[PDB]
Structure formats: structure tokens, C-alpha cells
Amino acid sequence: KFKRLPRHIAIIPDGNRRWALARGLEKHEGYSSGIIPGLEVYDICVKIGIGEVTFFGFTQDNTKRPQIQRKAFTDACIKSVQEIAKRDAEILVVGNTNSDIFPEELLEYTKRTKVGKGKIKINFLINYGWYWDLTYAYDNSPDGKKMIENIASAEIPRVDLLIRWGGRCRLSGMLPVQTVYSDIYVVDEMWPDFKPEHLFKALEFYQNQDITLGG
Amino acid sequence: IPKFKRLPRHIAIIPDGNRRWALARGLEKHEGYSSGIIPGLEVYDICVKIGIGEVTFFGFTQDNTKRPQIQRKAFTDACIKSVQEIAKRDAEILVVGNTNSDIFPEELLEYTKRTKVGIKINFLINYGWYWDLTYAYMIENIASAEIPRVDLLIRWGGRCRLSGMLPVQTVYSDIYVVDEMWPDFKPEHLFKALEFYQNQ
Ligand SMILES: CCCCCCCCCCCCCCCC(=O)O
């Protein structure tokens, strides 16, 4: 139980192909084991009263990978959205829907959708690209102020805390406008090895930040 | 100096921790910035020595100018001295920031187009991420368009965040946090960051 909680947590559920290779599995076979961890993060966030969580699903650049991996991460993303849809969330999917790569299955979540009891915002980046996001604005806006509040991800507010699994300390183009001031916590374990303590340590790190220091 | 297997093309530096450094030494909060000038030179010297192509220094942002006036003068004066000390060396200097302000130092106006064209050192001075992206009014028209993708961003003072540095160029950057405050810069801080980078 925390004095200070982030309003909005970003999750980069990385390490799936490494986890699978380490386990004696094929690379493409780790993604199926990323679905459960997502559901557990959702569970703990609801439980402590986190307002909003954004999951990084897959990028436009991720779809340049072997088809056996694209099929596998895409299916795992589809199923995570469908499963949170079975819970008590306000669900939103953001991504380039003007592409055959965007899964039909997720179109119905491209406007925020209340399921069960609601009262937690869950976002998924699906066929997302930072360049697509920033320039969604540049195309046919009156000015700079309008351009920025009309990025593709404009419905997603500033990220307070970004937690990335798989031990890499990088944003991989997740929400460059919303992450300018995000505190970044790296978990060395791969996403399918998610444990609650990963999120609890990320929340202790956020609480432990010195609020006198400014942006 | 270690022999490096691979090096980044472009290092970003966030020289943070100056105020905590001064407080820990019983000095005034604003009295740590001037102890950040020589560390800048040490980084420059190591980067030329090992042949890094480009370094961008976070100097100060528009958000930083909300700080007390006594802090603002100390960090602005230290940024001006750091640009001047690098300008004496064999470096192509570029300053990026909002010059349409009383805050922008007239001394640095001559670096707002890259000098000695033909190591590249960039400084962000009265820089703002919102100001940068809105400058066009795309990749090539933002205020910082001359500054390419950052490969490795190294931040002193223990905080793991960009504080609005170059949102476009940092999207894929590998980030290395030194817990020590910037005035406590040691050569091994930069070497451990390069060992991190080559291990990715
Ligand atoms: C610019 C090269 C070195 C300059 C010497 C240090 C004095 C100016 C640097 C101020 C750094 C401010 C970084 C603050 C980051 C943040 O906003 O959290």
C-alpha cells in the first residue's frame, strides 16, 4: 500500500522470444505465454486503484518479422484484448486501422468501450508506430497547438511510470509525447516470467522519487 | 581506456544532479552548476579520443527556467561557459533552442547554425520538446531536425527519464543511468555506459 501512485502506467511486455528459446521452445511460441501476465498486471492495478494502464502490443515495424512470429504476437494481442474485454475495464485500442495488418478482431475497441463494472482505463497499442502517431496530426491541422492535441494517441494521457520487461532500457517508440517525463523501471526477467514483485518494485521506485527535483 | 568492440554514432548526455551535489557538500542549491563545466570537457576529450561522431548535451530547457532566478543564472552561465570551452576545440558546434526569448543567451546566437562544417557537439539551450515538435507548424521540419537519432543516452543523478530531451531522436535510444551526480563525473561512468551499449 503506497502513499504516491502513478496515474498512468505504460507496460512494455518484452522478452517473449528469449524466454521461449531459454525454455527449449521456438521463438514464436513465447508470445502465447505473454497473455496471462497481462491479465495479472490488470488484476493488481485494479486492486491498488491505478487509473490507467497502456500495454505496448506490436508496432508497424514488428510486422516486418518472420510471418510465424507476426501470426503468434498478433494472435496473443488479439486474445489479451478479448480477455480484458471479459473483465471490468474501459478498453481502448490505438493503432493504424488504415492497413490490412490491423486485426479485424480489434476494430470494435478503437473507441473506448466499458465492459463489466468499468472504472479502470486499459489501452493497447496494436499496429502502432511513433511516426504514424506524431504525423496523424501534421496531416490537415490548423496550427502547432491543434497538431499536438490531435496526434493518433491523443486519447492516451501522459505516462507517469513506464515498466519494461526483458532488461532493455529503451522506449522502442512507445508514445514519445506521453513519455517525455516518464520514470522508466526495467525488469531484467522476460515478460512470461512476470511476478507481482516486478510491479510492486516498480511502484516502490515511483513512490521513492524525490518530488522536490522537478521535471 | 578500454578497447571497444562497437561504439555508438551519437551519444546524448543529461548532466543532472548539480543541486543535490552542492547540498551534499553544504553549498547552496545553485552552487553546483559551475562544477559541471569541467566534466563536459572531460566527456568531450574522451569522445574525440575514441572517435565518437556526435554528442548532444542537454543544457537547459524552457521547463528548467521555472526554477528560482538564482539557479537559472547559475545553470545558464555554466551552459554559456561550456559552449565557449568546446568552441576553443576542433568541434562543429550547434545550439538548438527557442531564441525568441529574453532567456536565450545572445552569446550563443552564433552557434544556432553549425560551425566548422566539414566531432559534432550539439547543446540544447532554452530547448522545449513541445516547441521542437510544433516548430514546422514532420521528421525534417522539427526545430532539432539537424540532430540525428540518439544511439546511447547517458544520464547522471540517478533519475531514469528523458525530461523532454529530443522525443523524436530518443525513440529507440539505449538509456544508461549513473547514480552519481554530474559534478561527480568520472571517466569510468562513460566507459561503463559504452560497455552497456556494446552488450546490447
Ligand atoms: C551542458 C553541458 C554541461 C553544462 C554544465 C552543467 C550546467 C548546466 C546543466 C544543467 C543540467 C540540467 C539537467 C536537468 C534535467 C531535468 O530537467 O531533470
Author numbering:
A (entry chain A): 5 to 219
B (entry chain B): 3 to 120, 124 to 142, 151 to 213
What did the publication describing this PDB structure actually write?
MM_0014 from the methanogenic archaeon Methanosarcina mazei is known as a versatile cis-prenyltransferase that accepts both isopentenyl pyrophosphate and dimethylallyl pyrophosphate as acceptor substrates. Cis-prenyltransferase (cPT) generally catalyzes the consecutive head-to-tail condensation of isoprene units and produces (Z,E-mixed)-polyprenyl pyrophosphates. MA1831 and MM_0014, which are orthologous cPTs from the methanogenic archaea Methanosarcina acetivorans and Methanosarcina mazei, respectively, unusually accept both IPP and DMAPP as prenyl acceptor substrates. The overall structure of MM_0014 is in a ζ-fold, which is similar to those of so far reported cPTs.
After cleavage of the tag sequence, which should have given the N-terminal sequence starting from GPGYQMDIPKFK where the methionine residue is the putative first residue of native MM_0014, the enzyme was further purified using gel-filtration chromatography and then crystallized in its substrate-free form. The asymmetric unit of the crystal with a C2221 space group contained two protein molecules that comprised a homodimer, which is considered to be the typical biological unit for general cPTs. Subunit A was disordered in the region upstream from Phe6, and subunit B was similarly disordered in this region, but also in the regions between Gly120 and Ile124, between Tyr142 and Lys149, and downstream from Gln213. In each subunit, a β-sheet was composed of parallel β7-β6-β1-β2-β5-β3 strands, and there was an antiparallel β4 strand that existed only in subunit A. The β-sheet was sandwiched by α-helices, and a narrow cavity was formed by α1, α2, α3, and α4 helices and β1, β2, and β5 strands. An inorganic phosphate, which might have been bound throughout the purification process, existed at the opening of the cavity of each subunit. Moreover, a long electron density patch was observed only in the cavity of subunit B. Because the density was thought to be derived from a fatty acid bound to the recombinant enzyme during the expression in the host E. coli cells, palmitic acid was placed provisionally as the ligand because it fit the density well. Although the C-terminus of subunit B was disordered, the C-terminal structure was resolved in subunit A. The C-terminus of subunit A extended toward the cavity of subunit B and covered its cavity opening, where the carboxyl group of the terminal Gly219 residue interacted with a carboxyl oxygen of the purported palmitic acid ligand. In contrast, the cavity of subunit A was in an open conformation because the C-terminus of subunit B was deemed operationally disordered.
